[PDB]
Amino acid sequence: MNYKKNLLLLYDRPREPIFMGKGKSVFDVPDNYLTDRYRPIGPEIQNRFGELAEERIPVRSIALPDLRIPMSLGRQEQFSLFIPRHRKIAARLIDIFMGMRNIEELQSCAVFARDRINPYLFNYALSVALLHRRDTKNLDLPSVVEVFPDKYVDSRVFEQIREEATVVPEGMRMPIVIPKDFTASDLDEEHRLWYFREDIGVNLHHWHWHLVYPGDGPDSVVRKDRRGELFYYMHSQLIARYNFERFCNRLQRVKRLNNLREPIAEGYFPKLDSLVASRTWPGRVDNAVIKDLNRELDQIKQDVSDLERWIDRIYEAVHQGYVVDESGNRIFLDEEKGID
Amino acid sequence: MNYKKNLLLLYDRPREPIFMGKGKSVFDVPDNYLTDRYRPIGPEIQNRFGELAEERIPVRSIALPDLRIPMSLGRQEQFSLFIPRHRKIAARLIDIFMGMRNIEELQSCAVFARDRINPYLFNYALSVALLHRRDTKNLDLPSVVEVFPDKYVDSRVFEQIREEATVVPEGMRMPIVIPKDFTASDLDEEHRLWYFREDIGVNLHHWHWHLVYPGDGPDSVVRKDRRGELFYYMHSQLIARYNFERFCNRLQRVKRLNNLREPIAEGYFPKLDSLVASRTWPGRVDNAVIKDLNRELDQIKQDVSDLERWIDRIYEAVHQGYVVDESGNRIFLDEEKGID
């Protein structure tokens, strides 16, 4: 009953229902644990999936926390921790996996949750939980690349893989070469930094940072010592490291955005497609304008001048040498704690 | 008129008392118009000057306005239009010079005032007056360079001239070469813009501008159409022309001061000495710190914070799209009037 090892299976093939069996194992899930769609074909499922496996994993039925908030984001929708609504949803699902009394009940709770939740969100929240619970330390989480390649690779290679896997028997299959320097041509000097910007290691680093220092969740997960300063310092070392690369590609140091009104010159077309959402990360044209936001579904109604305002407030607070509490009390930006 | 022309004789030899020869003329000064030092030896003075001269000018003794505010800046002190106290003093003098009914009565006021007031301030205040009185219009005022060379040339030439004039009779004298690129060596890249920054024409421009669009003074003189907009535009075109020159001396576009806390990289030592004040314009060392001011004589007590507060306020209005009146009313920064 190595729950720990069995939890790792929940990362295998995130869009495949859990009853299809991961690695060499299958879960034996209660009938009320199946979704409404697949409950009717329960018998057939057992037949193929259930029988072909070496290890069958019994899941004990339990009473389940309220999963509405985490289910409220759609299975074919996109997931961003930058959008407040999604942060709030993730925070809650994290609390739920943190709060299970038992590593066995975590297994049972996750098995239930998995095919009812957005896979990206499931990966995030489950990961943050496994990294923080006492009973799930020392656990070798799969790289996000390994389980969601769609966020890391030219969308063109998926059919190249689909074909190779389908036509060629495995022992004979050729590795697929991942394109590099593929997002832009020589006419865009910015393409020179492909090896920094589009390197799975640095993007994983950015992702890992939001796994260890999430912005909303249980106190235990959020409140790390000096996390406000690490935020500053990490983003600051990235720019230092990014400028080092620029100097090595005959470019200038990177220039801040002048303001939030003038166009952004450098466009970008990522060439990524999401197999979860079956929708792209739309590129941004050259010379695009920042526009007032009214995203009803995302729950974002915010003008550019609302952003201008926060920045102004923040600059006033930096110049004053203190921030003002929600009550009106002064907290000094001293030498020890000001940066945090 | 002849009175117009006599007013111009007041610009001749600024620190030489007005009873000494001006041009080919002399003023006949009512005894009580002499200063304290020279009233007692008034008789031994009238004989000692002017008998060489062709015209002699009668000055009518008249009742004069209260002259103590203009007098409060000392004759051997420096004069600045940026300093609020000095700006107020000049406004009062300007007021006086524009409040005389006749061009004759103006001659009398100026004649009296000259040897009692700071020469820089007198030249300034009279000059503004003459440019604006309805009865002294279209006057060819003499160039400031000619009257106050000490604001415009390396102080090393002053003794060169004094020698050449003292030793060599006027028929035989040769021209003094004014050094160029004299403020800094090629160790400093900024030195390359000597021909712009230290150009007499350009400096005269800056000066003439502040004579036509003075910021304090009588309403008649200050309130010009769209002068707030001129101020922006005039300063915007200076940067533009500067940048052009920078692009022609292998330099980059000028960089804003980032803020008021960072040291100023670029030092500057002007090699000018004021003969009116017998003091220098002190240089500024490289990497100098802007410091809080407590200059009591100048009546300035201002912290770098006070300036940063003003700047934050102005940024807040611009983003708001309106400023707020002393009475609490909003005035909108619209497409026509906003810049002004």
Ligand SMILES: [Cu+2]
């Ligand atoms: Cu980040």
Ligand SMILES: [Cu+2]
């Ligand atoms: Cu100016």
